[PDB]
């Protein structure tokens, strides 16, 4: 690992598997930064940084978040429950902004309204706190410590009542528990720009780990089925405050198949056998919530298009033993319309229905993988799979995964 | 002096008005593709350019990049941007009337956000609805739109093309009425209206990420145009006193959808003095004469009732943390004339809070409010620089100048303005 920032980016529309990754790369840490998004979940990491099973790894949530604070508390308070030392290796940019909980709230509302048209959030009300970031009447963590912030979440409230009508929500008693925990917060809260310039400046070694994925992008992705942060490279120069010249490898996290969760197109989607054994074997679904996740064949024109705007120096293949039963693997390597190849991939979803998918149909393997631990002991026609998807992309796999431990991992170099 | 293939960045470092035009015209001349990355209509330039009979002509540029100026290049609005269409055809068409060809080296992003009428009556109306704590916006619907943006409900260049625009543009509407009450808007005419811009706007339409990516693997020199200025920076300026998109180098990443890898070169514009628009803090302000006087020559006035600029003295606090963000590769240093008849120049070196040194910029502006600002004080050189075109040929005292900011700051200056005029420019290297 070099001096400088190695980032950790989801390549597709999420849960890649990044967090078994950042878990397996922070052992080379000195940092291990979360850069942009919320809580969003990991295999129990949830807003923090997946690097701190890593006992000397400290932790830092760079002032591009969007910061639940009594769920980080929650998911700290669990972490050194199981016995890990947490509390003294996580600091917090006084920048990041406050998801409250009339967030959530509206962020529901707001699906509903849409009807038929809702982008199938999380519903934790990260959409809310970014468009109340952009319109500047956002809260921060430094405005935990300040006498107006009741004043000021009283407006906010108001504000969300006028749009969205009365809901019912404790207003007073969440300003009460949120200053509560202000004096919680307080000890971890830093400057996020010092604090990362001082780390690159001494020579420290930064792990990144982006949230959600590039396909979910608020410019990039499927608009307006996206998250509404940057979840691709720039949101880790913004949510840093780095030079971009301090990034040294970005690494793309790209599933062996593709899925997505909630609304939006999706062009290898299977809605027969195929996706339901993905689904089963693959174990897709929300760790709390049972939330069955969308399921098709692995997308290269996709990947082609992530690999543009992100500009992967290697990949991680991922979760590829979910395929060790199948006979028979496609892979989308071209979108038509018309009978004409359509270039890159298009912002217009109406243009994106009329696709037709091109695909290669690669030999299944027939073998458990799930016990391999070098290359050289893939099946041959796993070699050709991951063979295929490098010579497509242009860009090497450095790391396989083969199952969920982190000790299922593969690095070739 | 040759510009490298890959993305140049010419960025504000202060909080805006900084003299951002004449570095980006400079360097137009060695560019192929001139880009804006994020922001709106506030990238106001005027180039005036001296023709073969002697001749000068004003150009005007806004939301279209100034690197036009430049017969030769192609001209880019990224998908970071947000985009006022009657306003880009307005520009358009002066510059055109003028004799400068646009339309055909114009291209944009399908997927740019739209500012639509109603962004910038709402602009308005949460100013006033904030009273004495309104942030002194441009009212152009800046924030509007980036907020309709995060939201998921903003419309993008794509959308005009899109049969459900009228219905999606009803329901935005209808949105905007029930956050803020009933403001006269004459939905079904601007709609109408949109759909004819739209005709205008086909030829230029493009893939943005496929331009840009293309560009870059055949050797083409991108210069990117910043709009607005560090201090101004969403996450990273004096918020809420910020203009809401990423002012800062990472917004060109993101702008743009390019690899980091791709950046060569961020020059940053800092001011030889420092200005203000807007409410909050604002540590080297001064109330009296300095401040008048910086204003008066500095023409510090802007174009718009409600904007005239708060004056202060250099603060290299300010640019120390700049420069920690948006880690320059050199410096431009602006308006270096405008002190050329003070006798002693003050420059914020320090700020102590409770007799501690602060670190860093602080986020908390009731910290701000509290600093107490060490000053350097550097002897003026009282003479006229505005006709000098060469380093040697400055007083030693403005070079003494120069090597301070450049001393404290780590970074070297390449460029400095000595007035307003096109070539009123001494290159250092
Ligand atoms: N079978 C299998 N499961 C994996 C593999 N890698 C990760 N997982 C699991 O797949 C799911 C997605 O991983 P996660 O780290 O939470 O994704 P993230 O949201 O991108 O961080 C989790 O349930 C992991 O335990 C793999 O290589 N093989
Ligand atoms: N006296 C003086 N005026 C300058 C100088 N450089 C730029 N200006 C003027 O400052 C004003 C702001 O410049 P502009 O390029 O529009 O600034 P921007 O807001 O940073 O993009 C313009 O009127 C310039 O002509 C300089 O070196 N000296
Ligand atoms: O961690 C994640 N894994 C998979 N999908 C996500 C994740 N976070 C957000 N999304 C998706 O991003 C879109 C917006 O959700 P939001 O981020 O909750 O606003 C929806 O399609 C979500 O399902
Ligand atoms: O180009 C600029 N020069 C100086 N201040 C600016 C500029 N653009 C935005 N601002 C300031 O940024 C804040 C937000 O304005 P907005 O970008 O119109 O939303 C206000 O304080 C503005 O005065």
Redesign the interface.
């Known amino acids: 690992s070099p001096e400088g920032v190695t980032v950790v980016l989801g390549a597709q529309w999420g849960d890649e598997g990044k967090g078994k990754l950042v878990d397996i790369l922070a052992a080379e840490a000195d940092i291990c930064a979360r850069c942009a998004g919320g809580n969003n979940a990991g295999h129990a990491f949830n807003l923090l940084p997946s690097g701190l099973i890593n006992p000397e790894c400290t932790a830092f949530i760079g ?2 978040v969007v910061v639940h604070v009594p769920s980080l508390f929650n998911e700290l308070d669990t972490l050194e429950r199981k016995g890990l030392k947490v509390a003294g290796r996580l600091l917090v940019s ?2 990041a902004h406050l998801v409250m909980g009339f967030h959530q709230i509206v962020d529901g509302l ?1 699906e509903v309204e849409l009807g038929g048209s809702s ?1 199938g959030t999380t519903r934790k009300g990260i ?2 706190a ?8 956002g809260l ?3 405005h935990l ?2 006498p107006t912030f009741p004043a000021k979440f009283r407006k906010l409230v108001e ?1 969300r009542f ?3 009508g009365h809901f019912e929500f404790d207003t007073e008693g969440e300003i009460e528990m949120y200053l509560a925990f202000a004096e919680r917060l307080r000890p971890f809260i830093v ?1 996020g ?2 604090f990362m ?1 001082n780390a690159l400046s001494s020579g420290k070694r930064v792990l990144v780990e982006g949230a959600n994925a590039l396909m979910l992008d ?3 992705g499927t ?2 089925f ?1 998250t ?1 942060s ?1 979840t ?8 840093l ?7 040294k490898r ?1 690494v793309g996290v790209i599933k062996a198949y593709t899925t997505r969760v909630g609304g939006g197109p999706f062009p290898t989607e299977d809605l027969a056998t195929v996706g339901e054994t993905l689904q089963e074997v693959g174990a897709e679904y929300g760790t709390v919530t049972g939330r069955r996740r969308r399921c098709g064949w692995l997308d290269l024109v996709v990947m082609k ?1 992530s690999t ?4 992967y120096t290697s990949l991680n293949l991922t979760k590829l033993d979910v395929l060790d039963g199948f006979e028979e693997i496609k892979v989308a390597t071209g979108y038509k319309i018309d009978g004409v190849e359509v ?6 979803l ?1 243009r994106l229905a009329k696709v037709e998918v091109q695909y290669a149909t690669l030999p299944g393997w027939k073998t458990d993988i799930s016990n391999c631990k070098t290359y050289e002991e893939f099946p041959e026609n796993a070699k050709a799979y991951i063979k295929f998807i490098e010579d497509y992309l242009g860009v090497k796999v450095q790391y396989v995964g083969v199952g969920p431990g982190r000790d299922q991992n593969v690095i070739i170099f």
Not at 232 to 239: A, D, F, Y
Not at 241 to 247: L, N
């Open positions: 002032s591009g006084d920048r707001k982008i959409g809310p970014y468009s109340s970031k952009a319109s500047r009447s921060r963590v430094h410590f300040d504000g006028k749009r969205y400057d720009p010092t310039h608020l410019d990039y608009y307006p996206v509404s940057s691709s490279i720039g949101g880790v120069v913004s949510g405050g780095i030079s971009p010249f301090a990034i970005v298009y543009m705007i992100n500009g270039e890159g991939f298009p912002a217009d109406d």
